[PDB]
């Protein structure tokens, strides 16, 4: 539903098919925000989260 995939995970079609948040003078980069982070916290990391299924947490 958000069209990014694990290298071990399968790939699919895109389901759907300027911002000052993308300013380089307001973004500090220390660690990369990778696929796992955006999957685990979709409302935190993925703008426009649509039809997103939230995972189970740690049993």
């Amino acid at each position: 539903a958000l069209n990014m995939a694990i290298p071990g995970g399968p790939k699919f079609e895109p389901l759907v098919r300027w911002n000052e948040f993308n300013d380089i003078n307001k973004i500090i980069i220390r660690q990369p925000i990778r696929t796992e982070y955006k999957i685990a916290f979709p409302y935190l990391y993925n703008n426009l989260p649509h039809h997103v299924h939230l995972t189970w947490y740690h049993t």
């Binding site: 916290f41 979709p42 935190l44 703008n47 426009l48 989260p49 947490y57």
Partner: protein
């Protein structure tokens, strides 16, 4: 935490607003501390150029910040009780312990306003008269931070 804020943003995006809302990067907030004292005895003065105030900023000790933040010592204590607290375990001078005026940016914040002035003890009644306004200026300065 990130799970807490993702839950908050999920509640905002689903129940409390129907609007798709862009989210920036998560960062943290910092504070301001110092390493060495103020090398200049620096002053300012009132817009009517009569009252001239000179003060220096220096680092605090180890346990004092967490003690004020946990309210181990209080300004609600007696001044002698606060002096005994600063003199038994922090080994302060009694004059420097009685020189303490206010604590930090808020109620019991980790900054210590020491007013030890022998040139200005000749007008210490006027100094105590302007003590409260010095306390709100100190609280506002430590609240904002330059």
């Amino acid at each position: 935490g990130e799970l807490y804020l993702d839950c908050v943003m999920h509640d905002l995006r689903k129940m409390y607003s129907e609007i798709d809302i862009k989210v920036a990067d998560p960062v943290v907030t910092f504070c301001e501390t110092v390493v060495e004292t103020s090398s200049l005895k620096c002053f300012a003065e009132t817009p009517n150029k009569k009252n001239k105030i000179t003060m220096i900023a220096e680092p605090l000790e180890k346990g004092l910040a967490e003690d004020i933040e946990n309210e181990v010592v209080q300004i609600t204590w007696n001044r002698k009780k606060l002096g005994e607290f600063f003199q038994t375990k922090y080994d302060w001078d009694l004059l420097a312990a009685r020189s303490i005026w206010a604590f930090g940016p808020d109620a019991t914040g980790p900054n210590i306003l020491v007013d030890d002035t022998l040139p200005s003890e000749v007008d210490k009644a006027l100094l105590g008269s302007v003590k409260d306004s010095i306390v709100q200026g100190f609280q506002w300065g430590t609240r904002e931070g330059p």
